Design a protein around this ligand. Structure first.
Ligand SMILES: CC(=O)N[C@H]1[C@H](O[C@@H]2[C@H](O[C@]3(C(=O)O)C[C@H](O)[C@@H](NC(C)=O)[C@H]([C@H](O)[C@H](O)CO)O3)[C@@H](O)[C@H](O[C@H]3[C@H](O)[C@@H](O)[C@H](O)O[C@@H]3CO)O[C@@H]2CO)O[C@H](CO)[C@H](O)[C@@H]1O[C@@H]1O[C@H](CO)[C@H](O)[C@H](O)[C@H]1O
Ligand SMILES: [Zn+2]
Length: 1293
């Protein structure tokens, strides 16, 4: 099953197998050859520049660009044999990187097996034709004689070095010249040789600014991209091309009229599907049906075409071999006559796998590589990665993000501020960008002031012509018209599951007859070179002057801040600012006495000013408004100067846009019926088809508006955040340059003492600028949402309501015409359901679908998924919402991460910095107010000591709360009592108080991971569950509206004990009250079997001391009789406390055991996986002694074998090979242990047998026996063990 990646040096000799002299497709018949290397089955590498259709002068750096982002040019790259070996070795390493993750392994398998069709639309119908440069390349071989032989070879991919532009990779199918037109076999189902132009050293950079998630220690920074993910991105284009599904229509063209509009190439639908995520919805659902149908016809043509084949130009080609291979590729079936036919069910699964399965984003997650969030996310200058072949910089299992160097966490290996060894800045000579000029008329104190703006800083505004209007035209319902799908998507996880099951299919030999037919026509290189700049002339100051005014000079000079934008543009020493408080304190030349106070007062003013939030009652679905956006960017209405909040009350969120798009829609034509010939059966079907196509209009039109929003509205709100981030950074850079000047002027005694606290206050500026961006991103995210949900979607609804009433006339006149046929009973019943349907509008969804019912009981996993509105997961030390609604999450400096039930968990200590905040998305803002809901999470709290129950036993502290004013819900603790509280608008209160059990070894709030679930039914009661079992209940009826805080806060609040902590994992909210059967499935979903677990519920680890306790006899510890002798059970001591109502068996007595790997490899993991072979040691007198059974040693009933600690009799072998497993009892944190001999025979599971050895007393002695294997379904069993390590959260009293 594993795919083989070949190794070679460029200097290795030609062998006519893995190393050849290739004549590439666009050189066919010219007898020009290049050394080529077979990286794997059907993939070649040619270390040469992609020079096809070019001239030498195209490779030099031009003066400017016509379109797009920055481009790096270097004609000397990949010239020498040395350069070529370097290129070859880097590619091999990147292919090995891809192979070593199963996601990437599945991608490579699809590409290899998706062989092109031996033929195309203009080839012979009865024949397979290998005589085309679309499918085959020639190659020159030698004999021992020295004479040569022209053969040919079939292939899927050929990888070349980069063309002129080094940082823009390309994938292209071979083009054929037919009737003086370009024909692409990679576009109508057949496929072809795909040619890639690739360069691994030069990569794009992106940043962190817009992201919903935010850490305050990470902050905002730039990142560079992993070459392996860039390679995989292009391999997705190769995959589409090979199945012949390359999309080349319905492009998104940028408008380029105004200054603010970005100049790019048209964005293909190909690119958007490959990148994935939300921006694949720029293509509206109707266009996806067009593309699906196109490919369905193309494949049907091939199924017909393949059937006619009885010959081939190559005599050696076995015709029947290829037929079964193409049947497999295309998922064709056979009719009983013997012809190939398209099964449409099997087609839909194949089509979605290719177009919507592999995407950059989804691969990024599987590989732990950081990606951009949107396609329109800002690119910066590319960087160079000149040490990919150093394993200390980039390895073939983690890339840059290596765990042993602490660079996996928070994707720090890609972070340009942290990992400064891994990159170098690109040389200035070869880098070129599109700049536009902007000149303004100014009065002398020559004629003008001109600035240059970068194309990357401009905004993308989509053309109106780029979006469909097919949902507005006439649509004819009939009997035989079909249902269209409204979901085009496919799971990468499913693709992996499919890849793991599918049986191997060997391909035929890829050597074939020579290529003589055709003429090579290489497409000419479309140059992006330019000689001049576009200059714009506007007399008013735009946003671009307002940002340029905030720039500081690069010189160690005194600076001042002003509120006059025209002054700051002229004077080099002056800077624009929009914080009045900050402007005063910095401009006054600092005080000689109390200099530290002056610097301290700068920070207080910057904090007060930059942190300002507000709301507007008339804009009810925007939680956060930042007032200073107007003064900073010059977004202002006339007669509202210095009053941005009034300007927003009057105009609405549309004030923030730089281009107002037309939101009015044409009339949606009513549904028409063409069904004259009618039986009674065919009428009822035509009524059902009429209702379905009516439903499909609402969804089609909704998704059309969303597409338009994404390309024309959302892109404008996105840039405003970058413009604010740039602005806030300009202000921080200035204030620091003021302090740097005034520090060097300052003359006092303690200058050297306070030095580091001055640098400590300069750091606090960037902290408060990042906290400001949290509000600004919430403002732009929710404004952009409000314009979609309200303004734009109301236009769709207006036309859709009119579409309903017009189509109801047409439906009930068709009913009138054929009303007679079973009237009395069905005509009345059929009319009743129609009036129910058409009266109800269909709701618009901005994110996931609010479905909190789900067809009575469809399926418990589906019910749980569908009803989820919040779900916190922790990936690579980042906490985020994965539910679908994508609520913003804020992680504060001292929120800590610890081992969890399946990954890592949140850990909260008792100070104000230890905090996690979820700002609820607007879609789920008020779902708690009147409706049912459920909250679930794993909890772990330490055993409260006898002292702290006396001190802090009456202190109630909350740990999770939505409460303001004070209304909401909260989870709180008080001594050993768990408390759920529910409080409404009018001050009504309902609580559940759960008294924990006195036996702390069996208690829920005594240092163990336990699963909490709290349901809330408004028409009855709220129920508290722990591990799926009901523990408490309280009545919720007679309770009004609940009006929460917009943030759900995870924090220790009003807790007096400064040493208190808790741990919370998998925090989740559902929009309904779960029943016990739904809870049980939720509880057990988290209990995996991959990793074993300790007594506390955390992952069991190697090289860690553990005390053993048998589950069946939990009041017993393990003791040694003597070294080299047996182990046995003893009564463990205990602690009782009458007045405080607590007691427990004392921990940490008995033998210390240690687990080690039986066959140590070079792993980073210290986690014990189920099935791992292990060696068990006892740690006695700080020495390690092996546990095992000696050959023919003492044993009860000849079958229960007595274990021996550190046995070493000279001759006799000791069997010590053990296997750690989890065979039973999934809810308990126990593990079993199987013993083996030298020949791999089971000596049994480890447990105990009652008896006697010598004249010792009667003891439960430790043994190994196969007896247990016939008893694994018993409720209690003697082979289950707790592994108990010492923990901060349990000390004996
Ligand atoms: C109760 C007991 O002594 N169990 C130990 C067992 O002893 C054997 C006989 O018990 C069974 C059993 O219950 O497992 C009886 C079944 O009918 C047998 N089933 C079959 C053949 O299909 C099994 C089976 O033979 C074995 O498991 C082999 O794999 O054994 C037990 O009744 C018998 O006792 C008397 C007998 O009553 C009488 O004729 C006369 O007095 O002689 C016998 C011995 O005094 O003895 C059988 C063998 O000695 O043997 C197994 C061997 O692995 C265990 O030792 C088992 O004790 C369990 O051991 C566990 C871990 O080692 C753990 O300590 C449990 O708590 C013990 O019950
Ligand atoms: Zn692409």
């Amino acid at each position: 099953m594993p795919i083989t990646i070949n190794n070679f040096r460029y200097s290795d000799p030609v062998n006519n197998d893995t190393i050849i002299m290739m004549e590439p497709p666009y050189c066919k018949g010219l007898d020009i050859y290049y050394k080529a290397f077979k990286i794997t089955d059907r993939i070649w590498i040619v270390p040469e520049r992609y020079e096809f259709g070019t001239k030498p002068e195209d490779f030099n750096p031009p003066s400017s660009l016509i379109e797009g982002a920055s481009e790096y040019y270097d004609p000397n790259y990949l010239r020498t044999d040395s350069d070529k070996d370097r290129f070859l070795q880097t590619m091999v390493k990147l292919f090995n990187r891809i192979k070593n993750n199963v996601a990437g392994e599945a991608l490579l398998d699809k590409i290899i097996n998706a062989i092109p069709y031996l033929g195309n639309s203009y080839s012979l119908l009865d024949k397979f034709d290998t005589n085309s440069n679309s499918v085959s390349f020639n190659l020159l071989e030698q004999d021992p004689s020295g004479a040569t032989t022209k053969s040919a070879m079939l292939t899927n991919l050929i990888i070349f070095g980069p063309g002129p532009v080094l940082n823009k990779n390309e994938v292209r199918g071979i083009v054929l010249r037919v009737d003086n037109k370009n024909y692409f076999p990679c576009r109508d189902g057949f496929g072809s040789i795909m040619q890639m132009a690739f360069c691994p050293e030069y990569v794009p950079t992106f940043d962190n600014v817009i992201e919903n998630i935010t850490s305050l220690t990470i902050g905002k920074s730039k990142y560079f991209q992993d070459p392996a993910l860039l390679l995989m991105h292009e391999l997705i284009h190769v995959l589409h091309g090979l199945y012949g599904m390359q999309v080349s229509s319905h492009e998104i063209i940028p408008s380029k009229q105004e200054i603010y509009m970005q100049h790019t190439y048209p964005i293909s639908a190909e690119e958007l599907f490959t990148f994935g995520g939300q921006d694949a919805n720029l293509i509206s659902i109707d266009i996806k049906n067009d593309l699906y149908e196109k490919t369905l016809n193309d494949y049907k043509a091939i199924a017909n075409k393949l059937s006619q084949v009885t010959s081939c130009n190559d005599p050696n080609i076995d015709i029947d071999s290829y037929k079964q291979i193409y049947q497999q590729k295309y998922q064709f079936d056979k009719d009983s006559n013997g012809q190939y036919i398209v099964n449409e069910d099997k087609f839909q699964i194949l089509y979605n796998s290719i177009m919507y399965g592999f995407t950059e984003i989804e691969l990024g997650k599987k590989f732990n590589i950081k990606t951009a969030l949107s396609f329109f996310s800002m690119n910066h200058d590319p960087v160079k990665i000149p040490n990919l072949l150093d394993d200390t910089i980039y390895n073939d299992t983690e890339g840059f993000n290596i765990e042993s160097k602490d660079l996996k966490s928070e994707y720090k290996g890609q972070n340009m501020r942290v990992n400064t060894n891994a990159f170098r800045n690109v040389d200035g000579s070869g880098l070129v960008s599109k700049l536009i000029g902007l000149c303004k008329k100014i009065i002398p104190p020559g004629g003008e002031l001109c600035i240059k703006i970068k194309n990357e800083d401009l905004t993308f505004i989509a053309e109106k012509n780029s979006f469909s209007e097919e949902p507005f035209q006439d649509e004819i319902v009939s009997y035989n018209t079909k249902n269209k799908p409204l979901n085009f998507n496919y799971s990468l996880d499913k693709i992996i599951v499919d890849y793991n099951l599918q049986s191997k299919i060997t391909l035929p030999n890829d050597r074939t007859t020579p290529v003589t037919k055709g003429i090579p026509y290489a497409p000419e290189y479309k140059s992006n070179a330019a000689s001049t700049i576009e200059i714009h002339n506007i007399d008013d100051n735009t946003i671009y002057q307002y940002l340029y005014a905030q720039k500081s000079p690069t010189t160690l000079q005194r600076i001042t801040m002003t509120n006059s934008v025209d002054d700051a543009l002229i004077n080099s020493t002056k800077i624009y600012s929009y914080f009045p408080s900050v402007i005063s304190k910095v401009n006054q030349g600092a005080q000689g006495i109390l200099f530290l106070q002056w610097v301290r007062d700068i920070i207080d003013d910057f904090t007060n000013e930059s942190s300002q939030k507000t709301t507007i009652d008339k804009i009810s679905d925007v939680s956060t408004i930042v007032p200073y956006i107007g003064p900073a960017l010059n977004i202002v209405k006339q007669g509202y100067e210095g009053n941005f909040i009034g300007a927003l009350e009057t105009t609405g969120v549309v004030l923030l846009l730089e281009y107002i798009p037309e939101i009015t829609l044409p009339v949606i034509a009513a549904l028409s019926i063409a069904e004259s010939s009618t039986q009674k059966e065919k009428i009822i079907k035509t009524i059902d088809n009429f209702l379905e196509k009516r439903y499909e209009k609402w969804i089609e039109v909704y998704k059309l508006v969303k597409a338009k929003w994404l390309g024309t509205v959302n892109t404008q709100f996105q840039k405003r955040s970058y413009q604010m981030y740039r602005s806030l950074e300009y202000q921080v850079d200035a204030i620091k340059k003021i302090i740097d000047y005034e520090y060097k002027i300052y003359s006092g005694p303690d200058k050297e003492q306070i030095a580091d606290e001055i640098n400590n206050l300069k750091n606090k500026l960037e902290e408060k600028a990042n906290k400001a961006m949290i509000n600004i991103n919430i403002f732009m995210r929710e404004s952009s949402r409000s314009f979609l949900v309200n303004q734009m979607i109301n236009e769709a609804k207006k036309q859709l309501l009119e579409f309903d009433t017009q189509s109801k006339n047409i439906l009930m006149q068709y009913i009138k015409a054929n009303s007679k046929f079973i009237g009395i009973t069905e005509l009345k019943k059929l009319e009743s359901k129609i009036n129910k349907v058409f009266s109800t509008p269909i709701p618009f969804s901005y994110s996931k679908n609010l479905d909190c019912w789900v067809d009575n009981e469809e399926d418990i996993d589906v019910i749980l998924k569908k009803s989820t509105i919040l779900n916190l997961d922790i990936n690579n030390d980042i906490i985020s919402d994965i539910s679908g609604f994508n609520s913003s999450v804020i992680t504060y400096p001292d929120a800590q991460l610890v081992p969890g039930i399946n990954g890592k968990a949140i850990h909260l200590v008792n100070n104000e910095s230890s905090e996690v905040i979820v700002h609820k998305a607007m879609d789920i803002e008020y779902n708690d107010m009147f409706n049912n809901f459920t909250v679930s999470f794993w909890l772990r709290v330490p055993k409260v000591s006898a002292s702290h129950l006396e001190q802090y036993g009456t202190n109630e502290y909350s740990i999770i709360s939505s409460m303001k004013i004070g209304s909401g819900w909260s989870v709180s603790l008080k001594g050993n009592n768990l408390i759920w509280t529910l409080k409404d608008s009018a001050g009504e209160v309902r609580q559940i108080t759960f008294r924990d059990l006195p036996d702390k070894f069996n208690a829920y709030l005594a240092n163990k991971w336990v699963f909490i679930t709290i349901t809330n039914d408004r028409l009855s009661s709220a129920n508290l569950y722990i591990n799926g079992v009901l523990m408490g209940s309280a009545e919720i009826t007679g309770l009004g509206a609940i009006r929460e805080d917009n943030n759900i806060t995870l924090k220790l609040d009003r807790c007096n004990n400064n040493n208190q902590y808790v741990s919370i994992d998998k925090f989740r909210i559902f929009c309904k009250a779960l029943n016990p059967k739904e809870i049980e499935k939720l509880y057990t979903s988290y209990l995996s079997i991959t990793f074993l677990r300790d007594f506390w519920g955390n992952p069991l680890r190697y090289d860690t001391e553990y005390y053993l306790i048998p589950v069946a006899s939990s009041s017993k510890d393990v003791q040694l009789k003597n070294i080299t002798d047996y182990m046995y059970l003893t009564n463990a001591p205990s602690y009782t406390n009458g007045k405080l109502n607590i007691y427990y068996r004392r921990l940490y007595n008995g033998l210390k055991f240690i687990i080690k790997r039986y066959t140590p490899n070079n792993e980073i993991d210290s986690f014990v996986k189920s099935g791992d072979f292990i060696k068990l040691y006892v740690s006695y007198n700080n020495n390690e002694h092996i546990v095992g059974y000696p050959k023919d040693g003492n044993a009860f009933n000849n079958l229960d074998r007595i274990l021996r600690v550190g046995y070493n009799a000279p001759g006799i072998p000791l069997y010590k090979k053990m296997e750690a497993v989890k065979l039973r009892d999934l809810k308990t944190y126990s593990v079993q242990l199987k013993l083996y001999d030298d020949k791999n025979a089971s000596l049994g599971l480890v447990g105990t047998h009652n008896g006697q050895i010598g004249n010792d007393p009667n003891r439960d002695i430790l043994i190994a026996s196969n007896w247990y294997f016939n008893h694994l379904k018993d409720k209690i069993l003697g082979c289950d063990w707790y592994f108990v390590p010492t923990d901060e959260g349990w000390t004996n009293d």
